[PDB]
Design a protein around this ligand. Structure first.
Ligand SMILES: COc1cc(C(=O)N2C[C@@H](C)OC[C@H]2CCO)cc2nc(N[C@H](C)c3cccc(Cl)c3)oc12
Ligand SMILES: *[C@@H]1O[C@H](CO)[C@@H](O)[C@H](O)[C@H]1NC(C)=O
Lengths: 11, 27, 250
């Protein structure tokens, strides 16, 4: 994916 | 109370580069 | 946004990205109207003809952003949805009449240099500013042309268009809950929203009080930036009774 990974807390 | 006033613009009395184009259209 | 330019830092601090989880992608634009309420277009969340039917747990709200794809650590804030409210008379079948939805966030978002709500118009603000020829501003991370994607948030300023001209540009029935904007073919300037910009704000800066008001929501256009076509926007003031009702109730 083109999107940078988000912190795991938000998932 | 403080809606629609941008910290980096209105709050510091700085204008963005194209807001005057908007103003100039408001007769 | 087609034929726009890069936003300045903090230029649109009410801008919200609706971000899909799994698979990680831009779902739509939106706008921050308070510390717990986000405004968007209903068709961003529910549109049966394209099999769109997102629930609260399917997406995130990303506020304070500039870069499209980067995780903007210490700048952007990411919020979870508590609840989605779609207008009960949203007409997805026919014309996208009342293309409006609200979302309540799980927790209040902290305001900062990059994160700040836009004002909603009242009747008087609508009457003053929603006039043919008066320009507003459209922001988003959608496609740069019809048929690619920006590195940072894009801005374009566009004139409101006379209602008969709007109607004569399309086969779709245009209601009093919609307005259109964009330049005509002669004018020597261009620009439009495009795929991924829906649900974002059309804003105007009141010359009376120097505040920014969200007058429109990016709804739809036939293609993007075509000569003789215009963008259609949800008329926020006309739907404000509903907005106030959802917020006062919930
Ligand atoms: C279901 O959502 C959409 C549908 C269509 C569609 O193809 N439409 C409309 C519908 C009311 O009627 C059917 C048929 C008519 C025009 O082809 C076009 C759409 N464009 C968008 N969003 C993009 C960002 C956009 C582009 C330019 C200007 C603006 Cl304001 C917005 O969402 C659309
Ligand atoms: C959308 O999904 C909800 C819950 O998942 C369901 O109740 C609703 O009927 C669906 N609407 C559609 C597919 O139009």
């Amino acid at each position: 994916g083109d999107f940078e990974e988000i912190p795991e807390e938000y998932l | 109370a403080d809606c629609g006033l941008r910290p980096l613009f209105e709050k510091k009395s700085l204008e963005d580069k194209t807001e005057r184009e908007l103003l100039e259209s408001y007769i | 946004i087609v034929e726009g330019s890069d936003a300045e830092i903090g230029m649109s601090p009410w801008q919200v990205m609706l971000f899909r989880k799994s698979p990680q992608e831009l779902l739509c634009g939106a706008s921050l109207i308070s510390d717990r309420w986000v405004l968007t277009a209903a068709h961003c969340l529910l549109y049966p003809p394209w099999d769109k039917n997102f629930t609260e747990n399917d997406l995130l709200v990303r506020i304070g952003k500039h870069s499209r794809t980067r995780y903007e650590r210490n700048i952007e804030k990411i919020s979870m949805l508590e609840k989605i409210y779609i207008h009960p008379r949203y007409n997805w079948r026919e014309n996208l009449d009342r293309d409006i939805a609200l979302m309540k966030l799980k927790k209040p978002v902290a305001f900062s240099d990059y994160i700040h709500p836009v004002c909603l118009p009242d009747r008087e603000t609508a009457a003053s500013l929603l006039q043919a020829g008066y320009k507003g501003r459209v922001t988003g991370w959608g496609n740069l042309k019809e048929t690619g994607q920006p590195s940072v948030l894009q801005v374009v300023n566009l004139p409101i268009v006379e209602r008969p001209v709007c109607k004569d540009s399309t086969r779709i029935r245009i209601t009093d809950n919609m307005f259109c904007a964009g330049y005509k073919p002669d004018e020597g300037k261009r620009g439009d929203a495009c795929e991924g910009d829906s649900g974002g704000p059309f804003v105007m800066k009141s010359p009376f009080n120097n505040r920014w008001y969200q007058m429109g929501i990016v709804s739809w256009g036939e293609g993007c930036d075509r000569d003789g076509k215009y963008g259609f926007y949800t008329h926020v003031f006309r739907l404000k009774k509903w907005i106030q009702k959802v917020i006062d109730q919930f």
